[PDB]
Symmetry: C4
Amino acid sequence: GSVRDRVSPQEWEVRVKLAAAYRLAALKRWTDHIYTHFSARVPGPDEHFLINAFGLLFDEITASNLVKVDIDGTIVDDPTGLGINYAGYVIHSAIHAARHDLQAVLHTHTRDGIAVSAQKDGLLPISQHSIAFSGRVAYHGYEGIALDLSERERLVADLGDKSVMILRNHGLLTGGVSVEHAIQQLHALEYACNIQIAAQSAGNAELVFPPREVIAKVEEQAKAIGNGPGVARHWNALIRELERSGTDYRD
Amino acid sequence: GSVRDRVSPQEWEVRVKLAAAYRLAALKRWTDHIYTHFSARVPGPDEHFLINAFGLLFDEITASNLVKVDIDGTIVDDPTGLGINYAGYVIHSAIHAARHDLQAVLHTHTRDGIAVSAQKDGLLPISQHSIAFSGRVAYHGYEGIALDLSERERLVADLGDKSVMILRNHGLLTGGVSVEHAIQQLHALEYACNIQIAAQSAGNAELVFPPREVIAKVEEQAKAIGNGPGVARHWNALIRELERSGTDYRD
Amino acid sequence: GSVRDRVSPQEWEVRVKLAAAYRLAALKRWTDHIYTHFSARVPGPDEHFLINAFGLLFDEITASNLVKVDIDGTIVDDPTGLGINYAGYVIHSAIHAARHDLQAVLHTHTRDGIAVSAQKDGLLPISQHSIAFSGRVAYHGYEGIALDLSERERLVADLGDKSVMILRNHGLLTGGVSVEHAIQQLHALEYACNIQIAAQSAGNAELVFPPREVIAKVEEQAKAIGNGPGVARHWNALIRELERSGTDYRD
Amino acid sequence: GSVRDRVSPQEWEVRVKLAAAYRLAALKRWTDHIYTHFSARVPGPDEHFLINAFGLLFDEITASNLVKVDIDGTIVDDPTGLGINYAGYVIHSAIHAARHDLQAVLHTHTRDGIAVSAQKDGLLPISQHSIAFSGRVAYHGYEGIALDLSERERLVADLGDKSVMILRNHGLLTGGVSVEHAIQQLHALEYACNIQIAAQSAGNAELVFPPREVIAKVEEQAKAIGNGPGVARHWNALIRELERSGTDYRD
């Protein structure tokens, strides 16, 4: 294992975690073929980041084949020779630069995530799962495929201090203080969206909205919560489940 | 097998049944990662109960690794050293204490169960499967994640004499005189919800509601029915299907 | 193989075909656990019929374990000792007695079949798949679980000369001049329903209804069609696909 | 391998590609049993085309068993002796004759493709995936199963210069300058439809439509795009994924 021989032990553990995140997304079917990306900061004094190689499926990602790039997307270490999807990295770059606290940035294009993205009122407070996101979610209006400077500014302004964003007509974005934290938020958000699409099948007018005070209570209940013990527990079970398919991801 | 060596044969058989119930829910995809729980009373002179260890997936549960707790959730026998989700057990505790007849209490967070939970009119009488629940279903208004004393009282009052409850905006709850009885009711309810979400895709106004007399007839037809021979038959087939994936659940 | 030793070669081939139909329904997920049933007439001078044993899953059915019953549901030959679901057989009995041309009667409780059943306008003419059923489909109003004499009469009157019925709020019924013919109609109907539930997700008012003449043309195009060469071709591919899972069904 | 011994290396590579396209559609569940078809032009001085043999599943198709036919559907080389679905080939023939640039023509009958087909406003501009098709999509009104001369003319007129068509109440059609190009467009269109059906579950009135300028921008962004490097990358990943199930398709 030549990659693990030359990188810091701290970089290696993040390579393993980010690769597991790619494979988990594949297992949970949060994928859109070769498009969309998960990034993580390499711990250390350098503004370096890990992302998938250009054209590999989430299913193929390993600790060893992730690509290390700088804030601009310039290859620092590409064990594949495939490089990266330079245009797909811009959103990751914009967020990582603006928010040094976010060590991981996930973006997905799932059926139900995009579906919720495409609705005026976005994510509704109609389930325990969605209500837990009350006051945690940023929205960003759709501006096209490429993220120009004008939009990059608005994207950061829209996110503000939050770590979950719905990219309207586009999909979902989650940040975290770790890969584990980002993935826990993404997993929960994706489920909240699954449930919304079913719930609303007869129209939003059939929905029961719990009272504002109840929403507020759940907000307080969830406000006690990315370095908490609940993150590690959730993640460790995902890992045990993943390993059930073999351990290639961490080579 | 050290667990089976020290527990009563009656406790052991309930450990096996409750473990099968966890694995069946995993097979049928009634799961929400590591959240939600199934409990059973340990037969005997002690108010002791079995539940999953904190952080294990339904897929991992075995007769040997279930945790035995008292009515408060205090460990009596924890073969895993993981303890339990103390806060998740409160609903089980509230119901078991109030209703000594219910030997099993199941709670789920499925896509379609929560979806039906989230609708004003809840479960509609529009299919044989849903109509069979007519007059069997309690509703409980959503009050947040943690179940405080004020809500615990209302939860018991809402359930009354029934053994099926829709926890609005939250999910489904089933009780039974046995694990088998509880699981049969849950299986049927979950299917009734699947069917409702499809049925109503063009709006509730497109639905055919059979006449009241017909609903009443089905109520009488189902009123002949948790110690009946139909429970054992349904359960024994679930077991044969489960065993098709291996017999680890009963170790 | 003791069953095959004592039955006519003509009975044996229908046992094989009906068992394949049970397993195919399981493969295609047209099942409702241990409920619902497929029946076939045993060719010969006796009014005898084959059906699943009480409590077996569709997945478990074999040529050897099907049960032979008379028009009343009395066991003639039960290789399992499990008998039959006597109450579930009544619908099969009512139709087989009334329509000697129908050598097979299938009844299902699928998510989308029941969903379409539950709607005022039933199956809409909005896809090639649904339009092909125009003028082929009977409807029967829901009257409860048990089929009493009053309802048995109406069921036969409702079906009339047709061989496809939507049992409102209940599910789907298909007949055929053979198991192959019945299964082809059921497969097509189930797909037409899948498509309808998706199509109508924004309401029936968003639907494009092709002109009446076009519907009429498709009716004529499908009117050329249960002993045609298209039935055998469709069935033979289902069999090849089934055999991909092993050949236990025909033992 | 007798087929590969007698055909040009250029024909052989298209046989391999078209077979992979059939198996991929099976893997991605874009199938309707034995109905629907993918065609490709055989490179060379002859107006010859490849299509599946009559009655084989997409899952069974191999480079060796594809059938070579002329523009009329007359067998030129049928390694199976099964011939072709002559009536199913007419749409392929009509398009291939009219548009010599299209080396591949795909037609599908998927749940969500037909569903979108069945709606007045067809494919809505409410997601990145659908907006990318803005101004690329032809519509053709439904006229029945058989494609007569009057309809053949209208079908070609409706398609015009485009290479993507929604066959209203019927399903989807994609063309391409290669099998790879056609498949990339089909994959994207099918996903756009999946997302639309979810998005619109509470009605089209809940949808956010990005402004016209934003749609226009995406049109320009996608207008840079069937011989581009993005086609090969998308296709090569599909192939790697397919090969994960074995390499029978290319024998």
